[PDB]
Write an enzyme that holds these catalytic residues in place. Structure first.
Site, mmCIF file in Angstrom:
data_model
loop_
_atom_site.group_PDB
_atom_site.id
_atom_site.type_symbol
_atom_site.label_atom_id
_atom_site.label_comp_id
_atom_site.label_asym_id
_atom_site.label_seq_id
_atom_site.Cartn_x
_atom_site.Cartn_y
_atom_site.Cartn_z
ATOM 1 N N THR A 189 29.255 87.754 15.065
ATOM 2 C CA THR A 189 29.839 87.365 13.793
ATOM 3 C C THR A 189 28.837 86.526 13.031
ATOM 4 O O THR A 189 28.198 85.660 13.601
ATOM 5 C CB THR A 189 31.148 86.577 13.996
ATOM 6 O OG1 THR A 189 32.079 87.381 14.729
ATOM 7 C CG2 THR A 189 31.777 86.209 12.675
ATOM 8 N N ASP A 244 29.997 89.400 7.911
ATOM 9 C CA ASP A 244 29.706 90.750 8.348
ATOM 10 C C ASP A 244 31.005 91.501 8.624
ATOM 11 O O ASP A 244 32.099 91.059 8.268
ATOM 12 C CB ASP A 244 28.799 90.742 9.571
ATOM 13 C CG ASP A 244 29.386 89.982 10.730
ATOM 14 O OD1 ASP A 244 30.418 89.307 10.585
ATOM 15 O OD2 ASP A 244 28.839 90.092 11.826
ATOM 16 N N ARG A 301 31.222 93.570 11.850
ATOM 17 C CA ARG A 301 31.241 93.992 13.242
ATOM 18 C C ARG A 301 32.130 93.089 14.080
ATOM 19 O O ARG A 301 31.948 91.873 14.094
ATOM 20 C CB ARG A 301 29.836 93.978 13.830
ATOM 21 C CG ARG A 301 29.824 94.305 15.299
ATOM 22 C CD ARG A 301 28.460 94.231 15.917
ATOM 23 N NE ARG A 301 27.613 95.315 15.472
ATOM 24 C CZ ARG A 301 26.327 95.414 15.759
ATOM 25 N NH1 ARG A 301 25.741 94.492 16.496
ATOM 26 N NH2 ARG A 301 25.633 96.441 15.311
ATOM 27 N N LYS A 339 36.558 89.774 7.850
ATOM 28 C CA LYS A 339 36.466 88.426 8.382
ATOM 29 C C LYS A 339 36.599 87.364 7.309
ATOM 30 O O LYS A 339 36.394 86.187 7.600
ATOM 31 C CB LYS A 339 35.138 88.249 9.108
ATOM 32 C CG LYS A 339 34.995 89.122 10.298
ATOM 33 C CD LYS A 339 33.646 88.957 10.908
ATOM 34 C CE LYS A 339 33.468 89.927 12.032
ATOM 35 N NZ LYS A 339 32.114 89.838 12.619
ATOM 36 N N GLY A 389 34.975 82.946 15.885
ATOM 37 C CA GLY A 389 35.540 82.395 17.095
ATOM 38 C C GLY A 389 36.471 83.395 17.735
ATOM 39 O O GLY A 389 36.194 84.596 17.696
ATOM 40 N N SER A 436 27.995 83.681 15.815
ATOM 41 C CA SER A 436 26.859 83.744 16.717
ATOM 42 C C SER A 436 25.562 83.949 15.952
ATOM 43 O O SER A 436 24.491 83.583 16.443
ATOM 44 C CB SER A 436 27.073 84.857 17.737
ATOM 45 O OG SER A 436 27.095 86.120 17.101
ATOM 46 N N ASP A 461 21.026 89.025 15.213
ATOM 47 C CA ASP A 461 21.997 88.669 16.233
ATOM 48 C C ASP A 461 22.728 89.923 16.668
ATOM 49 O O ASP A 461 23.157 90.717 15.828
ATOM 50 C CB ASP A 461 22.975 87.621 15.711
ATOM 51 C CG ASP A 461 23.911 87.109 16.773
ATOM 52 O OD1 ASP A 461 23.447 86.363 17.653
ATOM 53 O OD2 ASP A 461 25.116 87.402 16.703
ATOM 54 N N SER A 506 26.477 90.809 15.515
ATOM 55 C CA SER A 506 26.672 90.870 14.081
ATOM 56 C C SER A 506 26.158 92.193 13.549
ATOM 57 O O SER A 506 25.107 92.672 13.978
ATOM 58 C CB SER A 506 25.944 89.735 13.390
ATOM 59 O OG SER A 506 26.453 88.485 13.799
#
Lengths: 123, 196, 213, 216, 202, 204, 220, 199, 196, 203
Positions: G1, G17, G19, G33, G47, G129, G166, G169
């Site tokens: 994320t 994002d 994903r 999100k 989270g 992340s 990352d 993500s």
């Protein structure tokens, strides 16, 4: 440790320590074995009868396993060493294959022991 | 758990053992012999951790047979018991311990019959009867109840069968057959397998 | 406490043919939730007829492939000939078992040609159990790619379909399709696809693009 | 090393046209304590190879010892063979992997920059033997805070000049100083080129604290 | 985190850094750790950020309600006692080190420490946070009996600069606040305004 | 793992004016297979099914309490539930057990009872809804199902190609998982009919 | 994320994002999100996803109760206090890591809300992340009081850095541009990642699957 | 994994499945779990595939050395004793090996179960694997020493089929070998789906 | 460890249970019934953790009897099984969980015979044959090999006798006797104890 | 423990406290934590007492034999390289932070830190021990370039007195040592000789 090459060659191609060990055999008592049909008979020479001698401890015919025995000629101390080595190997072979030795197996073991003391250092 | 029992009479040792090899749910072998002939008058009965039993006892067997080959006479059953105890006690604190429970049965020509208990720590105990396994908890009180030192071997087989009937009645593992041998001055004799 | 391992990702793949083997992999080296480099191929030429695919802990991949290259040279010195692909497979079995008690965390798939000229795939576990296959996925998306190649190369669970021989071009399209499908859904699979085609002419090499996320 | 004691943070590194530039701050942190503030975490290996290390600093001094003794022992021979940067990278890969395999790791993460035969080298080695090459490297929190900036520029413009690489390095070190809690505003920039290895230091960042008033 | 408050004659000087770390990542580098509890009573927050913000908001609530009922400015010892009761009642749920400092007409400029565990003690100067450990010797050597407002601002600035220099958990800008009867003067020291010191080079 | 205790493998795939939901048929306690006809897809309407993989007791518990809540809803409200509203109902039911959570991960496949628009979604064990337009998968062979569906799903499929696609996806996906399989049942949901087929699957 | 947000001259640009990962497998390629809280306040979520969903729904509901009662447009600090007091009440067990942005009568306000209940009122925040990549982009290129499109390019650049750097993500960039005069919920704003074109063909025709039993049930 | 073997009047029937699982993921459906040691002995594969494969390949190497040194083929007893003494040196070191050494020797048919825990027992019938209990069911219900040869093939195939049906970790093909006096033969490799249509 | 088996034919359900209660190495009881008569045509068969079996199963027993007394008619085996599963799942995450493994046999007037498998997690499955215990591992393959849906009750008792003979042959635990019952259209019939 | 060594022009000043604790029991309250390695080289010991004593004895051995071989006074870098070699080779085995400070004819007064783990760095001043944390800020705001012997003695004594005041593991007396070309001057500060700092009592 002692690591000299005791048994070496000669200019005529001979291993003199092996030939002299053969001479040490030719001063030992005459061991005779005859293979028959259902019996094999060993017989050795006493040659030092000596009626004070207790005849059990100087028996030159020794049993290696339940089905293999042997007689020798030559140095009885070397003989007793090779006999104990062969008795240990007969027990190890009963351990590892669950069968007794053949006579070829323990003969090959004894002969490989003697040959390894013809080629190792300090022996 | 695997069951051993010895009974030492005046001139004989009666030993029995369960005839079962198991792998944790299944009885993989129901004709499995836990008795090991050391010499012509010595049995070593071995239970314990898998692998350690056969490895340790075949070690002991080859060294006792090697003693007879080197020497022209056998070990006494006392000497065989102390040899077995010594090797087990030396291997106790080594890298490769043997987790084996042992009954060494034996008849000596001078000492008479002799039975030896031995736990996995190698404590050696001469006993008029002894047993291993969890079935020992059920059977040793029957043996305390009914054994006298002058027991005949026919009454010894009947007492052994009382112990095995108790294992059938009360013990939780299926132990249907029992290899029964007896050692006396004439050697080791296969008696009839007590079956259920 | 110190851990001697890390999972570096990467999907590898082999397909055997009638006169070829194809060994493919992505080029993404990873660790945890980051990307070390987007150009780290996992296919390694061993002979003119053999490519190995290595995925898992990349330190063991580097060490293991340098050991295999050294042992190929030792064989070619003491035996005066190159190793066969089955010999490389059995040697790698003994090598991976030589570290049985502290394993190479490597997923190995040897792909190449045998002495009859046919395709050969040998897929291994991290401790050296190999068997010969017709196709195998290994690595990060092995569970994603092994069913589709059971479907499309193995012809499993298809009624009324003639089991045609696998051409080079249809297998190349299969490799590119399985890696686009794996780069969509696997997070460790992406950035490029390195394809090594082992035929009797040699080992030709072909890179195509994947997702960079 | 099972338990690293005085450590270093991120070491950057990026290739450019004509050489390689790396950077690292001049701090050894003993825990959260910024304890040793004038150390050099950049080694000049030989005329064409340089090193920088994150992680435990005593192990980096051991590797300076062993690798400098290797380059001395090589140059004693006088036979026209020097270790390439790739050879130092391969030696370190084998060294760190062998220490890993004894379960006695050198707790480092190293960036081997080099320039030999018109060819830039930039190689990563960590405490496990995971080794590779990249146009831009960053260890520690640099992989999180500077490798995004480095790879975004190196994806737009894959070939940098020396000043473009130096500007990118200094701006990444600024970001590492804002957001890494173990960084320090005092760093060396080492640049290997065809002329050799040149370590410039100490350099500092020009920070920007305008958002300290942007609450209400 | 380094928090600091010094009593002088007429009022108090408070100081804090601005670094909030999530492990060893600076999550917030301009953190306002100087919380206005009432009009002339501030607190310095150290420890768990959720704990300190919760306890500071709750003492702000209780203290403002107390002041409206009593129709007077609150005491600094009253706000310090409310921090003490909250930080001692939940001392196994809270990880919060607080320095309460302020002014009141009854008892002048006051500085109270409420560390973790929930005790309360009045001090002339208080330091706290993970970086105060690096300046205990400095503040023992440097604090003089009876400094002025500017001398306490300079003393607090120097000690916070030193703690920011050595602690990794500390850093950022220096947020100063000086509370007296006329009101609260706040200032942010950033860049060259943070007192530099020389590293012993060569 | 509590999820893999019984196995379980459910997916739902979206077509043009049709959805497909498919599940494996093994009930097994760990390794031991027990039955080969376990229900993992329950009806939640005429054109609206939920599929539940995971722990089989929570499959039954969640499906029965959802049928409870759903029948009360469809009587108190006087309408068939919209599939988005069913998703929110399941998400509430799973999130009530947020720290004591039902070890099942639902998939919902259905048509809107007024629009006949295809709806698929799936949830985690504590009720995070996740609506897609191509496929949702859930179970102990999740990655096999992602590989097969990401390869084989193509948009705008009629119910015949939808049947073939979800069938090949389920069959070849559960034939690479040990604790799944032992049959596959496939429900094609159209506007005018429900097609229910069980497949010639491997039985090992 | 990777979720991120800035404050520009006229308002708030939030970004996320799309994903969602279940383990190290991309489960949802197009997760939303950025969550509605009020018509002037949205919230990015990271989270535990179910925790952020149910948390933002309860606080969105309580601001609807609040602003129906007051008759006013709700404040961003009201959503802030509700979020941080419920997350502190639940001892950090609800892992809702939230970026709270909005524009009210006092101007544009931006918040980052940690799962244990601590908040940061900042001109630019990132979570997830892939937060450190996006904060590297923000610390590189943020200026105070940017234009709208400069802030949109900055937040899409931060989300794109989190996407490509990352593993957790990817797949799209969403934005939410908030000001006093508008609410631009841009879903998607950028598609950085295209699926590669399928080279083969895998249409398993009719009759490929063997069927044991079949039950047709007609409907109304 | 499911293996079995039983001695009957006409030799030794050895049967095994072909499924290897990496936990729950079926890694392979074509695993050769009856290891072809020499032309006169068969071994099986349960536990670790690499452990069984390596240690019975090293057994094959040592049995061929035995045959070269003693000019005669090794017995089943000595071969299983070598395997047991090889794996005894790794107790607690984590070898996962469970296997059955199957052959003919001068004592007739031979079948010794040998594992890494240290058991080495001979016996008429055994079954080793995770689905060994479901093979013992069908096998113990259908076994006699006087099985005819086709009936013995049917018994072993049916027992491996039933074990694959119940055990999740068993599946693939039923590989069936037969140890006669002149060496073993490969009897069949029957896919369990095909036996499902058969049975 | 405790063995259950049900074999469900066309117009009957054959059920058996072992008859042994054990305490760690001993059997404390060898005529121990594990079948609890719910109604005139329903048997519950309950094994599992000690204490929990009698408590849970007698709870279910008194509630099925309460249903019959309140209503003037019995529960069906489907309804009794789903009630039992509801109570075992509602107690699963509570402060008092029952670790009991269940077979519910029964003949319904409308639905014929029914056999229900249920484990300790309370996942309910309907089965033509089912078994609990470690002996289930040895006997479900015999059932799979020899069950046909049109099995007669004499042939079903023969198949049961095959499974119990496998328990006597291969299984490690002493399970000598087995309570055997058939539920018909005429109710629950005690058959002879299959003893060994 | 608080150990300290400050370099001036012409030599160094070493300083340590004197407290050895067994938990919170002061086992020795007059501990001599300055050890003469050679005639113009000391080491400051902090950490495990057994470890530091054994390493200081072994480096005293090696350095004395080295200096008799080379027919030279040893270098301070040589003594610190020996401590580094022994404290790095046994870094999992030891808890030993050493400050090596002394004088040599070739390079002057030198202070090197060999902290735990076993690295080595030359510093102008060096502190160590459990109590050195309390005086990092004081020694940073107080250290001046170009101090004399007397200013370095007073700076070392002040910073040690501060650290001994706040640390519980530090305390006792202050053992100072100034090492130059002329020799070694050791002195003990005790009672009022230790610098007092007034506690801020409430006015």
């Amino acid at each position: 440790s002692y690591d000299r090459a005791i048994t070496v060659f000669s200019p005529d191609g001979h291993l003199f320590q092996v030939e002299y060990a053969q001479e040490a055999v030719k001063k030992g008592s005459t061991a005779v074995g005859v293979r028959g049909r259902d019996i094999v008979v060993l017989g050795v020479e006493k040659k030092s009868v000596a009626k004070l001698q207790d005849e059990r401890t100087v028996r030159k015919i020794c049993a290696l396993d339940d089905n293999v025995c042997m007689a020798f000629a030559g140095l009885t101390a070397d003989a007793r060493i090779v006999i104990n080595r062969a008795r240990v190997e007969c027990q190890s072979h009963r351990l590892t294959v669950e069968d007794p030795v053949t006579v070829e197996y323990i003969t090959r073991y004894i002969a490989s022991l003697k040959q390894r003391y013809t080629q190792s250092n300090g022996r | 758990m695997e069951y051993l029992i010895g009974i030492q009479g005046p001139d004989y040792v009666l030993v029995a053992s369960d005839r079962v090899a198991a792998s944790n749910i299944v009885q993989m072998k129901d004709d499995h012999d836990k008795m090991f002939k050391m010499s012509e008058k010595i049995l070593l009965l071995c239970v314990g951790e898998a692998g350690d039993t056969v490895q340790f006892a075949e070690y002991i067997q080859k060294n006792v047979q090697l003693y007879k080959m080197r020497n022209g006479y056998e070990l006494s059953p006392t000497a065989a018991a102390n040899f077995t105890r010594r090797n087990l006690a030396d291997c106790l604190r080594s890298r490769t311990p043997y987790h084996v429970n042992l009954l060494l049965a034996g008849y000596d020509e001078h000492e008479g019959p002799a039975l030896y208990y031995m736990d996995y720590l190698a404590a050696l105990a001469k006993a008029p009867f002894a047993a291993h396994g969890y079935g020992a908890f059920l059977t040793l009180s029957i043996l305390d109840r009914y054994y006298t030192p002058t027991i005949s071997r026919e009454r010894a087989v009947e007492l052994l069968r009382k112990c095995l009937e108790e294992l059938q009645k009360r013990f939780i593992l299926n132990l249907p057959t029992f290899s029964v041998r007896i050692i006396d001055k004439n050697g080791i004799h296969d008696l009839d397998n007590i079956s259920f | 406490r110190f851990s001697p391992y890390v999972f570096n990702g990467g999907t590898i793949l082999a397909i055997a043919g009638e006169d070829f083997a194809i060994v493919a992999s992505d080029t993404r080296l990873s660790e945890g939730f980051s990307i070390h480099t987007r150009d780290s191929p996992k296919c390694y030429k061993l002979t003119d007829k053999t490519v190995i695919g290595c995925s898992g802990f990349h330190g063991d991949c580097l060490t293991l492939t340098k050991i295999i290259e050294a042992r190929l040279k030792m064989y070619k010195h003491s035996n005066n000939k190159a190793m066969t692909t089955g010999a490389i497979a059995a040697m790698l079995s003994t090598i991976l078992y030589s570290r049985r008690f502290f394993p190479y965390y490597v997923y190995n798939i040897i792909g190449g040609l045998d002495e009859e000229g046919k395709g050969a795939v040998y897929s291994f576990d991290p401790v050296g159990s190999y068997q010969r296959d017709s196709f195998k996925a290994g690595g990060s998306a092995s569970a994603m790619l092994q069913p589709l190649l059971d479907n499309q190369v193995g012809f499993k669970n298809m009624q009324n379909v003639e089991h045609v021989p696998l051409s080079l071009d249809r297998a190349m399209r299969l490799v590119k399709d399985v890696f686009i499908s794996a780069a969509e859904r696997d997070v460790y699979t992406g950035d490029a696809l390195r394809i090594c085609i082992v035929t009797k002419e040699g080992i030709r090499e072909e890179t195509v693009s994947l997702r960079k996320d | 090393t099972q338990n690293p004691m005085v450590t270093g943070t991120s070491v950057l590194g990026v290739k450019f046209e004509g050489g390689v530039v790396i950077a690292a701050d001049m701090l050894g942190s003993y825990g959260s304590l910024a304890r040793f503030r004038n150390i050099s975490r950049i080694m000049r290996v030989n005329n064409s190879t340089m090193l920088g290390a994150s992680g435990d600093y005593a192990d980096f001094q051991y590797l300076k010892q062993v690798l400098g003794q290797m380059v001395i022992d090589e140059e004693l021979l006088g036979d026209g063979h020097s270790y390439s940067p790739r050879a130092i990278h391969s030696w370190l890969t084998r060294a760190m992997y062998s220490r890993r395999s004894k379960m006695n790791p050198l707790w480092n993460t190293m960036v081997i920059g080099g320039y030999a035969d018109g060819e830039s080298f930039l190689g990563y080695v960590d405490m496990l033997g995971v080794a590779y090459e990249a146009p831009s490297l960053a260890t520690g929190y640099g992989a999180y805070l500077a490798q995004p900036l480095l790879r975004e520029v190196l994806e737009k413009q894959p070939v940098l000049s020396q000043t473009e690489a130096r500007d990118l390095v200094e701006r990444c070190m600024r970001v590492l100083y804002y957001r890494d809690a173990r960084s320090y505003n005092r760093f060396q920039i080492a640049t290997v080129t065809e002329k050799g290895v040149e370590i410039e230091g100490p350099l500092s960042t020009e920070t920007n604290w305008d958002i300290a008033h942007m609450i209400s | 985190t380094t928090i600091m408050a010094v009593q002088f004659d007429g009022g108090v000087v408070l100081g804090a850094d601005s670094r909030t770390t999530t492990g060893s990542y600076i999550a917030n580098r301009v953190t306002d750790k100087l919380t206005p509890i009432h009009d002339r009573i501030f607190c310095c927050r150290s420890g768990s950020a959720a704990d300190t913000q919760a306890v500071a908001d709750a003492v702000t609530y209780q203290l403002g309600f107390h002041s409206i009922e009593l129709n007077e400015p609150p005491l600094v010892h009253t706000a310090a006692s409310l921090f003490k009761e909250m930080c001692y009642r939940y001392r196994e749920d809270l990880m919060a080190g607080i320095i309460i400092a302020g002014w009141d007409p009854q008892e002048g400029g006051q500085v109270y420490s409420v560390p973790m565990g929930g005790m309360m003690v009045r001090q002339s100067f208080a330091i706290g946070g993970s970086g105060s450990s690096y300046i205990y010797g400095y503040v023992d050597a440097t604090y003089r009996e009876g400094m002025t407002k500017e001398e306490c601002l300079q003393f607090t600035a120097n000690a916070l600069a030193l703690a920011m220099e050595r602690d990794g958990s500390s850093g950022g800008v220096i947020r100063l606040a000086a509370i007296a009867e006329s009101g609260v003067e706040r200032q942010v020291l950033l860049g060259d305004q943070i007192p530099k010191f020389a590293v012993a080079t060569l | 793992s509590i999820m893999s205790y019984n196995g379980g493998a459910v997916m739902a795939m979206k077509g043009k004016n049709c959805v497909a939901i498919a599940a494996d048929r093994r009930f097994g306690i760990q390794a031991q297979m027990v039955t080969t006809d376990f229900q993992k897809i329950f009806p939640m309407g005429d054109r609206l099914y939920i599929g539940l993989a995971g722990l089989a007791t929570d499959v039954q518990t969640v499906a029965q309490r959802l049928k409870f809540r759903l029948n009360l809803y469809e009587l108190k409200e006087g309408r068939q539930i919209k599939p988005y509203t069913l998703m929110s109902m399941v998400a509430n039911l799973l999130y009530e057990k947020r720290f004591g959570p039902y070890y099942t991960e639902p998939v919902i496949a259905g048509l809107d009872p007024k629009t006949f628009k295809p709806f698929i979604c799936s949830l985690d064990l504590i009720g995070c809804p996740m609506v897609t337009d191509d496929f949702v998968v859930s179970g102990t062979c999740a990655e096999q199902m992602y590989g097969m569906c990401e390869s084989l799903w193509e948009p705008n499929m009629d119910p015949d190609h939808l049947f073939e696609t979800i069938s090949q996806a389920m069959l070849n996906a559960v034939d690479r998982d040990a604790v799944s399989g032992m049959g596959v049942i496939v429900h094609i949901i159209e506007k005018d009919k429900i097609t229910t087929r069980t497949l010639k699957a491997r039985m090992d | 994320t990777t979720i991120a947000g800035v404050v520009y001259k006229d308002g708030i640009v939030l970004g996320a994002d799309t994903r969602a990962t279940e383990g190290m497998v991309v489960a949802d390629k197009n997760c939303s999100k950025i969550h509605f809280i009020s018509p002037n306040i949205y919230c990015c979520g990271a989270g535990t996803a179910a925790d952020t969903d149910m948390t933002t729904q309860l606080i969105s509901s309580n601001l609807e109760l609040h602003s129906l009662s007051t008759g006013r447009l709700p404040r961003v600090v009201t959503a802030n206090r509700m979020l941080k007091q419920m997350l502190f009440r639940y001892q950090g067990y609800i892992g809702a890591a939230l970026v709270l942005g909005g524009v009210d009568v006092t101007g544009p306000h931006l918040y980052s809300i940690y799962p244990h209940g601590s908040t940061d009122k900042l001109p630019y925040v990132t979570m997830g992340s892939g937060s450190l990549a996006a904060m590297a982009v923000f610390e590189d290129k943020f200026r105070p009081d940017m234009e709208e499109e400069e802030a949109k390019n900055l937040v899409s650049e931060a989300i794109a850095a989190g996407i490509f750097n990352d593993l957790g993500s990817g797949s799209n960039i969403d934005l939410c541009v908030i000001s006093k005069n508008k609410l631009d919920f841009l879903r998607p704003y950028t598609v950085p990642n295209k699926k590669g074109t399928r080279l083969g063909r895998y249409r398993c025709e009719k009759g490929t699957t063997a069927v044991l039993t079949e039950k047709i049930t007609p409907l109304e | 994994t499911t293996t079995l073997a039983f001695k009957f009047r006409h030799g030794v029937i050895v049967a095994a499945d072909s499924r290897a699982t990496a936990g729950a993921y079926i890694a392979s459906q074509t695993v050769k779990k009856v290891i072809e040691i020499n032309p006169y002995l068969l071994g099986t594969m349960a536990g670790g595939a690499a452990d069984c494969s390596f240690w019975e390949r090293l057994l094959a190497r040592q049995c061929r050395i035995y045959e070269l040194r003693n000019k005669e083929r090794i017995s089943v007893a000595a071969a299983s004793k070598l395997l047991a003494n090889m794996v005894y040196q790794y107790k607690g070191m984590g070898l996962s090996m469970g296997t059955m050494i199957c052959g003919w020797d001068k004592r007739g048919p031979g079948l010794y179960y040998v594992d890494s825990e240290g058991n080495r027992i001979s016996g008429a019938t055994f079954s080793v694997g995770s689905g060994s209990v479901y093979a013992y069911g069908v096998m113990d219900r259908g076994y006699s020493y006087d099985l005819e040869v086709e009936q013995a093939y049917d018994l072993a195939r049916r027992a491996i089929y039933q074990a694959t049906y119940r055990d999740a970790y068993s599946g693939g093909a039923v590989n069936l070998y037969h140890v006669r006096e002149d060496g073993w033969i490969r009897v069949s490799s029957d896919n369990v789906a095909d036996l499902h249509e058969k049975y």
